[PDB]
Design a protein around this ligand. Structure first.
Ligand code: HEM
Ligand SMILES: [Ca+2]
Ligand SMILES: [K+]
Length: 267
């Protein structure tokens, strides 16, 4: 353990406090950190993941990043108050806090990420997964990130919390009945419901027959269609502890892609 130069105890507490005043914020912090890592290509070794390069054009304007200005701006306050933290570390830390606050795992945090200085390091568009595409696309994107199928499914389970917004993705609604709880219920809703066409959302999405108030994207239900992905959907649906543990491991790996010289924070 190595004590960071910013007051991490106070800062964790401030993040929890922000999240408690604005509930919809917790999940967006997770989506922020994920999208900042998802630009990586492990074959080309570029894309500048975990560097807060999304603060810059062109990356901030990519369609996949629509709406992430909100968590970005919410975190600005905290950057002013703890100027020693890099934006990159801040985004990651916020998401870790978000996850634990919502009843998810406690991910061991490493600090020391260097912020991108300008948009020239940004990778191309077309790196973020598209909700309308299915398993061959999802596998292509995650293999480009460096993940196997197991880590892929665990990661997508973050859809346990939060919701889609028409104004951001063009999709509408939450995946689960408690969008502020972090657990395996994304995998439970995925197997236990009958997913029918939602006939009134312009961008094709499914709804649960039982209530019609839950949704799934084509990229979510593709996990059931692909026999390798389905395997891990079943794994996590039937064992919440295993999902907690695999998610924590995959998320930490993810928010550590393309980083170097990090220090272990105290718990
Ligand atoms: C197959 C890959 C994925 C696709 C296609 C996808 C797609 C989407 C879409 C379309 C939204 C709605 C955005 C909005 O309207 O605000 C969303 C939200 C979200 N995503 Fe994903 N996602 C993927 C994987 C992931 C992963 C790996 C994570 C994190 C580990 C993640 C975390 C989240 C969270 C927490 C939200 C809710 C955001 C909020 O309430 O503001 N997603 N995702
Ligand atoms: Ca990035
Ligand atoms: K949930």
């Amino acid at each position: 353990s190595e004590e960071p130069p910013f007051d991490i105890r106070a800062l964790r507490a401030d993040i929890e406090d922000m999240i408690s005043e604005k509930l919809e914020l917790g999940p967006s912090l997770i989506r922020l950190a994920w999208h900042e890592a998802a630009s990586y290509d492990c074959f080309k070794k570029d894309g500048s993941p975990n560097s807060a390069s999304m603060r810059f054009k062109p990356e901030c304007l990519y369609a996949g990043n629509k709406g992430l200005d909100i968590p970005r701006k919410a975190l600005e306050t905290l950057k002013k108050k703890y100027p020693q933290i890099s934006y990159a570390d801040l985004w990651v830390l916020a998401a870790y806090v978000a996850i634990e606050y919502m009843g998810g795992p406690t991910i061991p945090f490493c600090w020391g990420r260097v912020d991108a200085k300008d948009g020239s390091v940004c990778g191309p568009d077309g790196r973020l997964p598209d909700g309308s595409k299915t398993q061959s696309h999802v596998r292509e994107v995650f293999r480009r990130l460096g993940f196997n199928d197991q880590e892929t499914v665990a990661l997508i389970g973050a859809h346990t919390c939060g919701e889609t917004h028409i104004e951001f993705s063009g999709y509408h609604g939450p995946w689960t009945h408690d969008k502020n709880g972090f657990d395996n219920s994304f995998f439970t809703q995925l197997l236990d419901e009958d997913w029918v066409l939602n006939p009134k959302v312009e961008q094709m999405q499914l709804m649960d027959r039982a209530t019609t108030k839950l949704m799934m994207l084509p990229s979510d239900v593709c996990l059931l269609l692909d026999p390798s992905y389905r395997k891990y959907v079943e794994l996590y649906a039937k064992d919440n502890d295993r999902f907690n543990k695999d998610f924590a491991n995959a998320f930490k790996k993810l928010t550590e892609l393309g980083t170097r010289n990090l220090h272990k924070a105290p718990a």
